[PDB]
Design an enzyme around this catalytic site. Structure first.
Site, short mmCIF file in Angstrom:
data_model
loop_
_atom_site.label_atom_id
_atom_site.label_comp_id
_atom_site.label_asym_id
_atom_site.label_seq_id
_atom_site.Cartn_x
_atom_site.Cartn_y
_atom_site.Cartn_z
N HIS A 1 -6.30 -0.87 11.89
CA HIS A 1 -5.67 -1.36 10.66
C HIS A 1 -6.52 -2.49 10.07
O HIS A 1 -6.91 -3.40 10.79
CB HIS A 1 -4.27 -1.87 11.02
CG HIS A 1 -3.47 -2.37 9.86
ND1 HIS A 1 -3.40 -1.70 8.65
CD2 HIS A 1 -2.69 -3.47 9.73
CE1 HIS A 1 -2.61 -2.37 7.83
NE2 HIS A 1 -2.16 -3.44 8.46
N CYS B 1 -5.30 0.30 3.65
CA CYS B 1 -5.36 -1.06 4.19
C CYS B 1 -6.78 -1.61 4.08
O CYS B 1 -6.99 -2.79 3.74
CB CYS B 1 -4.91 -1.05 5.66
SG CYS B 1 -5.99 -0.02 6.71
N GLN C 1 0.80 -1.23 0.00
CA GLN C 1 0.00 0.00 0.00
C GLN C 1 0.83 1.28 0.00
O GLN C 1 0.35 2.34 -0.37
CB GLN C 1 -0.97 0.02 1.19
CG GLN C 1 -0.28 0.10 2.55
CD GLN C 1 -1.29 -0.01 3.68
OE1 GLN C 1 -1.97 -1.02 3.82
NE2 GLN C 1 -1.40 1.04 4.48
C1 LIG Z 1 -5.03 1.62 6.77
N1 LIG Z 1 -3.89 1.73 6.11
C2 LIG Z 1 -5.65 2.74 7.59
C3 LIG Z 1 -4.56 3.52 8.31
O1 LIG Z 1 -3.95 2.68 9.27
C4 LIG Z 1 -3.25 3.41 10.26
C5 LIG Z 1 -2.26 2.48 10.89
C6 LIG Z 1 -0.98 2.35 10.37
C7 LIG Z 1 -0.06 1.47 10.95
C8 LIG Z 1 -0.42 0.72 12.06
C9 LIG Z 1 -1.69 0.84 12.60
C10 LIG Z 1 -2.61 1.72 12.01
N2 LIG Z 1 -6.67 2.31 8.57
C11 LIG Z 1 -7.96 2.35 8.25
O2 LIG Z 1 -8.35 2.64 7.13
C12 LIG Z 1 -8.98 1.99 9.34
C13 LIG Z 1 -9.54 0.58 9.13
C14 LIG Z 1 -10.58 0.13 10.17
C15 LIG Z 1 -11.11 -1.27 9.82
C16 LIG Z 1 -9.93 0.12 11.55
N3 LIG Z 1 -10.04 3.01 9.23
C17 LIG Z 1 -9.76 4.28 9.53
O3 LIG Z 1 -8.64 4.58 9.94
N4 LIG Z 1 -10.77 5.20 9.41
C18 LIG Z 1 -10.51 6.60 9.80
C19 LIG Z 1 -11.19 7.60 8.85
O4 LIG Z 1 -12.57 7.26 8.73
C20 LIG Z 1 -12.75 5.99 8.11
C21 LIG Z 1 -12.11 4.86 8.94
#
Ligand SMILES: *C(#N)[C]([C]O[C]C1=[C][C]=[C][C]=[C]1)[N]C(=O)[C]([C][C]([C])[C])[N]C(=O)N1[C][C]O[C][C]1
Length: 217
Positions: free
Chosen positions: A164, A25, A19
């Site tokens: 994530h 993700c 990604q």
């Molecule tokens: C993916 N990629 C993203 C960003 O992840 C941040 C991260 C990076 C490294 C380690 C841990 C976390 N995550 C998402 O898209 C999540 C998914 C959900 C199933 C938990 N959703 C999210 O962050 N949102 C925020 C904005 O509104 C929509 C949902």
């Protein structure tokens, strides 16, 4: 239920994707789950367009492209849209773009999706064994996750606050240590060549069974 399952052995899992710096993700998790259903339905394994989701399953679906999204609403977009293009026809660029969906490049459709009950690892096991890979959210906001190399991942400071999106493509045990076989979208250099085996039946470790869902065709 079988003691272990690995959907890769069944030809239902595509190559691991990267990604990059785009937080897509959620899109990769969603196409990953649909890719297995497409193979089960048509006999063909084809990567689906995570970019299509990033660019088109946007505001109306509560998603924010590279800034985050939901697998469930991604599935609903595919259903509403009556399709999703192939990754080959709509390649991933690791950035937000205007929606370029075209039905002439449709590679799959989706008729519905199912959300599993919160925190039930037994229900998640049944779904992975009987339905296919399941999209899940996990708490990956801990150094140990980024540094994971091999074995069964267990992080004492993990929480059920997920952030994530990943894909459970199987389950099993490493000499007794039960795990969920997880496909990540951080490229093939992450963990076990793109996968991470996360502690299973360890009190909903890292929230893996907090918000599971899978699509059907
Ligand atoms: C993916 N990629 C993203 C960003 O992840 C941040 C991260 C990076 C490294 C380690 C841990 C976390 N995550 C998402 O898209 C999540 C998914 C959900 C199933 C938990 N959703 C999210 O962050 N949102 C925020 C904005 O509104 C929509 C949902």
């Amino acid at each position: 239920l079988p003691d272990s399952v690995d959907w890769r052995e069944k030809g239902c899992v595509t190559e691991v994707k990267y990604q990059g710096s785009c937080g897509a993700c959620w899109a990769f998790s969603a196409v990953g789950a649909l890719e297995a259903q497409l193979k089960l339905k048509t006999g063909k394994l084809v990567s689906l367009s995570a970019q299509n989701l990033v660019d088109c399953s946007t505001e109306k679906y509560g998603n924010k492209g590279c800034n985050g999204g939901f697998m469930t609403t991604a599935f609903q977009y595919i259903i509403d849209n009556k399709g999703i293009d192939s990754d080959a026809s709509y390649p991933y660029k690791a950035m937000d773009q205007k929606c370029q969906y075209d039905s002439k490049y449709r590679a799959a459709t989706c008729s519905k999706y199912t959300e599993l009950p919160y925190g039930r690892e037994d229900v998640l096991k049944e779904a992975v064994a009987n339905k296919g890979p399941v999209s899940v959210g996990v708490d990956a906001r801990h150094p140990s996750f980024f540094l994971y190399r091999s074995g069964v991942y267990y992080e004492p400071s993990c929480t059920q606050n997920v952030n994530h999106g990943v894909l459970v493509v199987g389950y099993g045990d490493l000499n007794g240590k039960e795990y969920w076989l997880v496909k990540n979208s951080w490229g093939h250099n992450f963990g076990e060549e793109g996968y991470i085996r996360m502690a299973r039946n360890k009190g909903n470790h890292c929230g893996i069974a907090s918000f599971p869902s899978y699509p059907e065709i």
